[PDB]
Design a protein around this ligand. Structure first.
Ligand SMILES: Cc1cc2nc3c(=O)[nH]c(=O)nc-3n(C[C@H](O)[C@H](O)[C@H](O)COP(=O)(O)OP(=O)(O)OC[C@H]3O[C@@H](n4cnc5c(N)ncnc54)[C@H](O)[C@@H]3O)c2cc1C
Ligand SMILES: Cc1cc2nc3c(=O)[nH]c(=O)nc-3n(C[C@H](O)[C@H](O)[C@H](O)COP(=O)(O)OP(=O)(O)OC[C@H]3O[C@@H](n4cnc5c(N)ncnc54)[C@H](O)[C@@H]3O)c2cc1C
Lengths: 392, 488, 259
């Protein structure tokens, strides 16, 4: 009773772009080994047949033509760029005789990976799509859109706001224009918030070794205020799990944390300006720490390493590379994915390509009242953290 | 208790092996083993493999709906080895199959009888492919016939009718085959799966679709078969050949159904439809004669298939073979058929005659070469029927078509495509070329070819070999063969 | 928009010769609208709306020729007076014979010669291609349409070219070339249109059928296609053509602001 009958298609930009190179920043190249897996669930599959979902993608990818390109490497006197050839994004059609409501309230290990396509910048580097969209119908009349999006292309505000310009397209409203016309140009020691790993050739995914797994949890507004009654919300439920993971593994005094702050955003829609920085529990054990102070720790004891990560020459892995890394995205328009009138019942984001340190993404819920948090863990580890969190 | 071994009888109606296994009382294990390495040169080709992959899936569900666990799919290079692993693995008493008639199966299958009877298996074989067994029809001295007319005249005058088609089992009992494993068979190169699946635009393999195509032909173009059977510009024939090659349809049902249509038409005064049935059964009898020939006068070494063309000096020219496969010969009736053979896996019998006659009369390439291509591109690629066709068009049969002779393409065009609509459907380039020259564009005046928007050599090819050169080279090649033949 | 089926009325040459009263078409369709509306058939009701709009385009065809006729100060396609046309009779002949290597272009170019008719959207595919890819004199492909269209209509041919060249505000965007897979997906989702007119490509899977030159050699051979011998190679490449497009448009806008 898994999801079945995949049959895949391509969509391209409506105009042919031509000889055109998209130079990507070194902040782009800094995340070349990480991949977002966003899945949006919809009560109704009604009126959203595959041609209605596919048809708007053509005008959409004329505004976002570099995501329909593929990767090449220039020679040195080897920095990679996006060949402006319209390879297009692959669309995967699949169904599941599951009722979607059943499956979202299941706490299922690995459904994020069942409803988004499984592939990364990989062995065939020069013909690998930057984006895949999988359309999964259910027998409930439900429909989940799982997007497999390379982080090299763009950050998560960039990923999430381009997908909804697509939904703005579909429903007949006019998106506000794409911005990529200030071109990206290039620019020490291994920054501590990231982690060095060996020359990466043509498959840009670091094998984790010990099998990682997705899982996520609702934290409601009631626990949102016992949070209060004990630094904003995201770094206290960031702090919640940071120590919870620390009684799981122990060596959890360093942690880096990813920030989707709109105040540092260039305005350009295909960028990579999420801000990167270390956290260290010097005073005492995070496993021995009371949550209200590691929360206090993750607000002002923040360290700006973002400028230095992009200037790193060499392959690094930041989410789950060096420390555990918490995720700042709670303020990203994920329930703006309005299919004409329908906005989702459920949105959850996963990831892969994140090292064995694990990572936790902190992002909003349907009501804007609590939060949803996805945790990447060494799979043997979610056994206990679910108990570990169950008290909280 | 009883194994039912499927081979080229992928149907459930009038299948004497399966219908006698079910009526024995015990269980029935239905299975198919894919042992192509045993077929030597006659290893099933590309598109014939694509048919079996769908036909077997289709026969699986049919079997499962009748009370089966599965069709057991075994893989091997020796059929006995895989068959007697299965008699052991699945532990049976008996092995039932319906016997074939090709030279490969005839002696492979008697090695199986003994191989299996040495490990204590009882074996029985049944008739599933012929109205009459080849030994059942002989002349007045008890000898095989050597020409088709006396042979088919005999079957039509046999003292008994072809056995009526048996019913399918009420249901079959297989027992628990949750134990028994089935080998996932591989019929398609990964590289070819995407173009193989486009064959479904024109065809749907399966016992069920064979049955719908028969009642479609019976209630449709069968009444005009007497007058239209030679035309390739309409659907004039039954389109049953791939279904019949894989045994997905009973020929004894077709015989019986057609004989009933004839009796009714005869009582309705429909004399032209009554002769239509006479002539269509004759076509069913040509399939009977293909088995009768491979059983009574098999390929030997003392005298092979095309033995009369031993000293024939063939043109060896891979370039010419490439142009022929691609339908760029410049002969429109030939090109049109070579395009349709590639696109659908099927050709009207007379377009087969045209493309194959052109192959050995104008290009004069080794008939083997074209026999092999046919094997890889035809959905109904049938050992005995292909042998009979090539033997017919090259003149190895006394029945066959004259050797020292080339057809005028207008003779072919007027018989199989009188209005040129076959050429125009498959070569749209020549749509505006009048019927008067559409089968020999090289003869048209430039004005007429300019009016038709045709530039011979850019828009549509020139004749790769001109007829008068082909005939001159044919007489020089036969005289070369006939001075050589006497030298022995 | 589909061309893989008989989706439009095929009343085109009849209406040009006044063999059928447009006023009768109007009245009958309008009354068909009323019955369907009353039958809850909203899609069908919506359909007559668009079909009458297609009738109105023929009205607008005469409107533009009555009110804004064109002879000398703004003749038809006056805005590209200053365009550097590729004068290449070889390329023209290859466009005429449907030997361009672009299937949807070649398919439609065969049907045009075969049946003297083309679907509207295919009328733009082979026309957009003629002026934005091969970039030959639009006056040239105009005279070919005039000779090979049964519904060869002075005003409506005028409108149709003005539309694809961008000669008027309703028209199509100029510095821009349609990706063939965009055309194919809107006008031919299963590639059955060009499989029917180019049986050579029958075995080419639908994914590549509108752009065979981007297919892996392993796929081309599995379909029995060999670009250059079996089916032609793209006479002009797209990259080399939008490049040429910029070099031809700004050269002209440079010529534009210089007079
Ligand atoms: C060079 C050559 C190669 C051929 N290769 C094949 C082949 O691989 N497989 C094959 O089945 N036929 C072959 N034939 C015979 C004939 O071309 C086909 O039987 C026929 O074209 C199939 O179309 P149909 O089913 O509509 O025939 P119909 O006219 O509808 O006839 C009904 C059935 O009779 C049988 N039949 C008809 N004509 C013949 C014949 N001449 N010989 C044997 N059986 C016949 C077929 O089973 C056919 O389905 C070949 C003929 C030639 C000249
Ligand atoms: C480059 C180009 C050239 C054209 N040349 C001609 C021409 O010579 N003659 C001609 O009649 N149409 C012409 N058209 C318009 C259009 O392509 C055809 O009218 C239509 O495709 C004919 O098919 P149909 O009759 O089935 O159309 P339908 O969908 O059935 O439309 C109904 C009728 O409305 C009229 N019509 C529909 N669309 C248009 C349109 N865009 N412009 C004008 N009338 C329209 C036609 O009379 C048509 O028969 C041209 C379009 C283009 C882009």
């Amino acid at each position: 009773g898994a999801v079945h009958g995949h049959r895949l298609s391509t969509v391209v930009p409506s105009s042919v772009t031509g000889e055109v190179d998209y130079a990507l920043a070194d902040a782009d190249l800094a995340f070349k080994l990480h991949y977002l897996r966003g899945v949006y669930y919809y009560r109704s599959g009604d009126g959203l047949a595959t041609k209605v979902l596919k048809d708007p993608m053509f005008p959409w990818l004329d505004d976002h033509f570099p995501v329909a390109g593929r990767v090449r490497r220039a020679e040195a006197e080897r920095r990679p760029y996006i060949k402006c050839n319209d390879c297009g994004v692959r669309i995967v059609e699949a169904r599941c005789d599951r009722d979607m409501a059943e499956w979202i309230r299941d706490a299922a290990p690995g459904r994020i990976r069942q409803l988004c396509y499984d592939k990364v910048l990989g062995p065939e580097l020069f013909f690998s799509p930057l984006l895949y969209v999988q359309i999964t119908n259910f027998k409930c009349g439900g429909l989940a859109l799982g997007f497999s999006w390379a982080h090299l292309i763009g950050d998560i505000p960039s990923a999430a706001t381009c997908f909804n310009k697509w939904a703005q397209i579909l429903s007949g409203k006019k998106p506000e224009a794409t911005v990529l016309t200030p071109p990206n140009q290039p620019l020490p020691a291994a920054p501590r918030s990231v982690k060095q790993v060996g020359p990466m050739e043509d498959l840009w995914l670091v094998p984790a070794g010990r099998d990682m797994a997705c899982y996520s949890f609702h934290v409601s507004d009631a626990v949102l205020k016992k949070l209060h009654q004990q630094a904003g919300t995201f770094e206290l439920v960031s702090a919640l799990v940071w120590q919870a993971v620390a009684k799981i593994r122990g060596d959890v005094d360093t942690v880096t944390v990813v920030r989707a702050d709109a105040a540092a955003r260039s305005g350009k829609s295909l960028a990579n300006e999420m801000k990167v920085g270390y956290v260290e529990s010097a005073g005492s054990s995070p496993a021995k720490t009371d949550v209200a102070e590691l929360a206090a720790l993750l607000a002002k004891n923040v360290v700006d390493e973002t400028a230095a990560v992009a200037a790193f020459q060499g392959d690094v892995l930041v989410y789950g590379g060096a420390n555990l890394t918490l995720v700042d995205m709670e303020q990203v328009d994920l329930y703006g994915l309005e299919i004409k009138g329908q906005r989702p019942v459920y949105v959850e984001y996963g990831m892969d390509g994140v090292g064995d340190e694990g990572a936790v993404l902190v992002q909003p819920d349907a009501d804007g009242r609590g939060r949803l948090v996805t945790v990447v863990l060494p799979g043997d580890e979610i056994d206990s953290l679910r108990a570990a969190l169950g008290s909280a | 208790r009883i194994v039912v071994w499927f081979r080229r009888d992928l149907r459930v109606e009038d299948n004497p092996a399966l219908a006698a296994a079910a009526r024995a009382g015990g269980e029935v294990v239905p299975a198919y083993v894919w042992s192509p390495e045993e077929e030597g040169p006659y290893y099933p080709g590309r598109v014939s493999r694509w048919w079996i992959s769908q036909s077997l899936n289709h026969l699986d569900a049919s079997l499962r709906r009748l009370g089966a666990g599965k069709l057991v799919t075994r893989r091997s290079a020796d059929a006995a080895v895989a068959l007697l692993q299965l008699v052991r693995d699945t532990g049976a008493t008996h092995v039932y199959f319906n016997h074939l008639y090709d030279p490969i199966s005839l002696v492979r299958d008697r090695r199986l009888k003994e191989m299996l009877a040495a490990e204590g298996i009882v074996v029985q074989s049944f008739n599933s492919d012929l109205l009459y067994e080849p030994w059942e029809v002989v002349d007045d001295e008890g000898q095989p016939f050597t020409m088709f007319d006396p042979f088919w005249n005999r079957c039509l005058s046999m003292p008994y009718d072809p056995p009526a088609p048996l019913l399918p089992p009420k249901r079959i009992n297989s027992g628990d085959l949750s134990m028994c494993p089935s080998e996932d068979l591989i019929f398609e190169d990964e590289s070819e799966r995407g173009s193989n699946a486009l064959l479904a635009r024109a065809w749907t393999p399966g016992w069920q679709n064979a049955d719908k195509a028969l009642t479609a032909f019976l209630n449709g173009p069968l009444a005009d078969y007497s007058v239209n059977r030679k035309k390739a510009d309409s659907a004039s024939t039954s389109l049953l050949s791939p279904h019949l090659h894989f045994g997905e349809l009973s020929v004894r049902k077709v015989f019986h159904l057609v004989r009933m249509k004839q009796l009714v038409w005869s009582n309705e005064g429909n004399h032209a439809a009554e002769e239509s049935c006479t002539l269509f059964l004759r076509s069913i009898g040509l399939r009977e004669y293909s088995r009768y020939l491979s059983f009574n006068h098999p390929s030997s070494h003392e005298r092979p298939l095309l033995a009369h063309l031993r000293f024939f000096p063939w043109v060896v020219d891979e370039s010419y073979f490439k142009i022929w496969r691609q339908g760029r010969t410049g002969y429109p009736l030939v090109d049109a058929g070579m395009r349709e053979l590639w696109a659908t896996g099927w050709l009207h019998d007379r377009i087969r005659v045209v493309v194959a006659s052109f192959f050995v009369k104008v290009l004069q390439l080794p008939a083997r070469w074209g026999m092999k291509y046919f094997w890889d591109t035809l959905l109904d690629a049938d050992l005995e029927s292909d042998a009979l066709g090539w033997q017919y068009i090259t003149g190895s049969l006394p029945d066959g078509r004259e050797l020292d002779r080339i057809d005028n393409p207008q003779f072919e065009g007027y018989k199989f495509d009188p209005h040129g609509e076959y050429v125009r459907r498959w070569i749209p380039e020549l749509a505006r070329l009048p019927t008067e020259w559409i089968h020999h564009p090289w003869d048209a005046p430039v004005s007429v070819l300019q009016a038709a928007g045709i530039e011979l050599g850019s828009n549509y090819p020139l004749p790769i070999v001109e007829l008068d050169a082909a005939k001159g080279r044919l007489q020089a090649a036969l005289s070369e063969m006939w001075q050589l033949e006497a030298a022995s």
